[PDB]
Amino acid sequence: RTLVTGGATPELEALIAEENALRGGYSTPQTLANRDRCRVAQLALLDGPFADLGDGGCYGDLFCKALKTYNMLCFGIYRLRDAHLSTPSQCTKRYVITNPPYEFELVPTDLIFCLMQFD
Amino acid sequence: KHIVVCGHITLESVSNFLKDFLHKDRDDVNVEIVFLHNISPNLELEALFKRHFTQVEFYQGSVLNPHDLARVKIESADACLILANKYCADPDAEDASNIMRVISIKNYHPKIRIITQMLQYHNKAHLLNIPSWNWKEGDDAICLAELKLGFIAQSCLAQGLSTMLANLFSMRSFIKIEEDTWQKYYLEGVSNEMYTEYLSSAFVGLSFPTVCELCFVKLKLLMIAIEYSRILINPGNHLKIQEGTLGFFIASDAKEVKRAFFYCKVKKYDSTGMFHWCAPKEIEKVILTRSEAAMTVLSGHVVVCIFGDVSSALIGLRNLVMPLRASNFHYHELKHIVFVGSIEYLKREWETLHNFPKVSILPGTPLSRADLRAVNINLCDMCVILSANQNNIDDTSLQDK
Amino acid sequence: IEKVILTRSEAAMTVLSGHVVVCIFGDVSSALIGLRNLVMPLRASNFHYHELKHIVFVGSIEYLKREWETLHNFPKVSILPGTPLSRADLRAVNINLCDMCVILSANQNNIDDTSLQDKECILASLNIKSMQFDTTGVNIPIITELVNDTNVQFLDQDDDDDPDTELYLTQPFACGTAFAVSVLDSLMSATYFNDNILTLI
Numbered sequence A: 001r002t003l004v005t006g007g008a009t010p011e012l013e014a015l016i017a018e019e020n021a022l023r024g025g026y027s028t029p030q031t032l033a034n035r036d037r038c039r040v041a042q043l044a045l046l047d048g049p050f051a052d053l054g055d056g057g058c059y060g061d062l063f064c065k066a067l068k069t070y071n072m073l074c075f076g077i078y079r080l081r082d083a084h085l086s087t088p089s090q091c092t093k094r095y096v097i098t099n100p101p102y103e104f105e106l107v108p109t110d111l112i113f114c115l116m117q118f119d
Numbered sequence B: 001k002h003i004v005v006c007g008h009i010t011l012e013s014v015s016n017f018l019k020d021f022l023h024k025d026r027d028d029v030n031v032e033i034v035f036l037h038n039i040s041p042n043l044e045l046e047a048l049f050k051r052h053f054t055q056v057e058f059y060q061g062s063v064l065n066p067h068d069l070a071r072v073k074i075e076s077a078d079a080c081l082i083l084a085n086k087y088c089a090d091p092d093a094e095d096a097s098n099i100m101r102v103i104s105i106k107n108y109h110p111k112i113r114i115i116t117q118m119l120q121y122h123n124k125a126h127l128l129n130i131p132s133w134n135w136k137e138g139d140d141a142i143c144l145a146e147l148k149l150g151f152i153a154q155s156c157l158a159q160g161l162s163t164m165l166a167n168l169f170s171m172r173s174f175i176k177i178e179e180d181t182w183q184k185y186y187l188e189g190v191s192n193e194m195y196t197e198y199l200s201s202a203f204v205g206l207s208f209p210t211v212c213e214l215c216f217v218k219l220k221l222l223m224i225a226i227e228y229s230r231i232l233i234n235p236g237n238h239l240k241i242q243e244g245t246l247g248f249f250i251a252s253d254a255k256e257v258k259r260a261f262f263y264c265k266v267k268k269y270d271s272t273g274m275f276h277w278c279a280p281k282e283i284e285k286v287i288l289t290r291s292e293a294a295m296t297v298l299s300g301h302v303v304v305c306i307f308g309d310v311s312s313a314l315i316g317l318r319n320l321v322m323p324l325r326a327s328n329f330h331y332h333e334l335k336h337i338v339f340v341g342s343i344e345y346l347k348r349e350w351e352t353l354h355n356f357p358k359v360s361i362l363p364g365t366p367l368s369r370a371d372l373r374a375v376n377i378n379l380c381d382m383c384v385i386l387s388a389n390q391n392n393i394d395d396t397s398l399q400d401k
Numbered sequence C: 001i002e003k004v005i006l007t008r009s010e011a012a013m014t015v016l017s018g019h020v021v022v023c024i025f026g027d028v029s030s031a032l033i034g035l036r037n038l039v040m041p042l043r044a045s046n047f048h049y050h051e052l053k054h055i056v057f058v059g060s061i062e063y064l065k066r067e068w069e070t071l072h073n074f075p076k077v078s079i080l081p082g083t084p085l086s087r088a089d090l091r092a093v094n095i096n097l098c099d100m101c102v103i104l105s106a107n108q109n110n111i112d113d114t115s116l117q118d119k120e121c122i123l124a125s126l127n128i129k130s131m132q133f134d135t136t137g138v139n140i141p142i143i144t145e146l147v148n149d150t151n152v153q154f155l156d157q158d159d160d161d162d163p164d165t166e167l168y169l170t171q172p173f174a175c176g177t178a179f180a181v182s183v184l185d186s187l188m189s190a191t192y193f194n195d196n197i198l199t200l201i
Helices: A011-019 A047-055 A058-072 B011-021 B043-051 B068-069 B091-108 B119-127 B145-156 B161-166 B182-190 B207-221 B254-258 B290-295 B317-325 B344-348 B368-372 C008-013 C036-042 C061-070 C086-093 C121-130 C149-155 C171-176 C181-193
Strands: A039-044 A073-081 A095-100 A111-116 B002-005 B033-036 B079-083 B113-116 B193-196 B248-251 B302-305 B339-343 B359-363 B382-385 C020-023 C055-061 C076-079 C099-105 C142-146 C178-180
Touching: A011 B119, A011 C055, A039 B145, A047 A058, A058 A073, A058 A111, A095 B161, A095 B182, B002 B091, B002 C149, B011 B043, B011 B091, B068 B091, B079 B091, B091 B113, B091 B119, B091 C121, B091 C149, B119 B145, B145 B161, B145 B317, B145 B382, B145 C061, B161 C178, B248 B254, B290 B368, B302 B317, B317 B339, B339 B344, B344 B359, C008 C076, C008 C086, C008 C181, C055 C061, C061 C076, C086 C121, C121 C149, C142 C149, C149 C178, C171 C178, C178 C181
Parallel strands: B002 B033, B002 B079, B079 B113, B302 B339, B302 B382, B339 B359, C020 C055, C020 C099, C055 C076, C099 C142, C142 C178
Antiparallel strands: A039 A111, A073 A095, A073 A111, B193 B248
């Protein structure tokens, strides 16, 4: 719930139990650091700084580098259906890879599931 | 120990629940399962019960009868499970029935764990207002509409996340495929599941990214969250992990999960500050036309298609818009949302959406290629197709045509 | 009616103590139940004016407007549109300081469902019992009306609920926090043998 519904905090749960509605508020020293949480994102390893590792680099190497560089958690790979096949084609359908091992190569046209912080 | 399963006892749901709960790859299956229903089972269902002879026992009775509840020995049961008809014509009647089941169970025994489905989100407050209910203790209820709409909304921002999350709960083994296709890679991906277990005490002063990379490079486990009264999704470089924080694990089986413990060495936002909030807006301020959509340049947006009318039920599009208006996003990074469908139906739900910004409505039908070209469906980030009347239509087959 | 219409803010800023609240589950289509006979003994004249009990109403404004034509002549009456299931709404009328709470059911007559009988009344009673204040809602005196006698088992939790047991032996009826119309059937045999209804009732 707290991952997919934006946020399910005890304070919000108590407020919705009390009111069954939502009301606007005002800026405070608190409820402004409340935005500091990770969100879902997709990263393309084509133009970013990690595109160098996208040729044949290790997925675990990419993961540890992203964490130690930006606290940039990544856990999934979005890969084309016929990317593994040597025959080129116009198919753009992409399947999902869940928790790749450390010794996993990278296709230069791969999309990676990721989580990033807030500024 | 034994558990009690009651509610919409239908054979396909029972088969799915048994094949998921009693899967061979679990640790222990010593717990027993007891059923309750007011209708006698059919011959193939006695065949299934005979197949699972020493794990499940059936009984005849009503969950609203205290004599039946004492007969099933609920006071000795570890937890109670409630199944609801996901394909009921009237969602409100099923929700009220499930609420009555919960009330009866809590009345017979105050302290016991109950898990149930929830067709509509607006009755969650009704269920929570029960005096004996305490979700802090472990009384948890799942809302089907909330989870589905959240999955779709998060898939809008990042495609594939819906199945990424949905494949983390189906308890499955690993099956090898040697055909060198996408199937083997997808199956190796889906072989993983979700587990929770307390980490070793050696990780106290370490930072969260440091312990993440350490556990990854050491024993091939990765973190997604930790328990703090709150669950923090990937804290970064400023949180020192406490003792017994119950980190969340992703692995193929609980055996590698156990390895971690045995370690060898103006009003812009909501009053809560959780989501963006704006002043109430009249629907006429967000009604658009074909020419208005043509002159309105839209790119990198979200288009949702809704089919229904006044006679149709309610989906709860507020519960879909809500995760897309979180405070985690900046204001100018928000995704514009437009609506295509019946205005007569959509006025029944607009009153739950006037507090959100960047919302547009285009009356018509989503089968109009002119309308789809007007909303610039070429440049949309994600297109969503729903159907309010998917359940109440007469034909058993030919659904969502 | 506009003179006695009260919204949440003005109801909250006003103070009420030792009052009587009424919860109504009805609409325009629901059958009339009659409330002049309810406010009548409260607005008798044995009481002095200062010791009179204030009465406020929580229910659908349509039903209140339909019933107002026979009720506007009584003093110290207020109307609050809304629903009795809202925790903030119940907090706005200071139930913790309220003398006692009454729950009705306007649409009990026309509903033909064997199940779901008095479900809204049971839910409201559970909610008011589950009320928590700065001290909880179990001590709030309430009376509820029931149309199915078997539903009385759900009104309390620390009770040995049994279906074979009849009505008056139950803990809610013995404590006076529950009531039903089925008790009134004995009045026919009572009045056949005597003349008690003519004066005493």
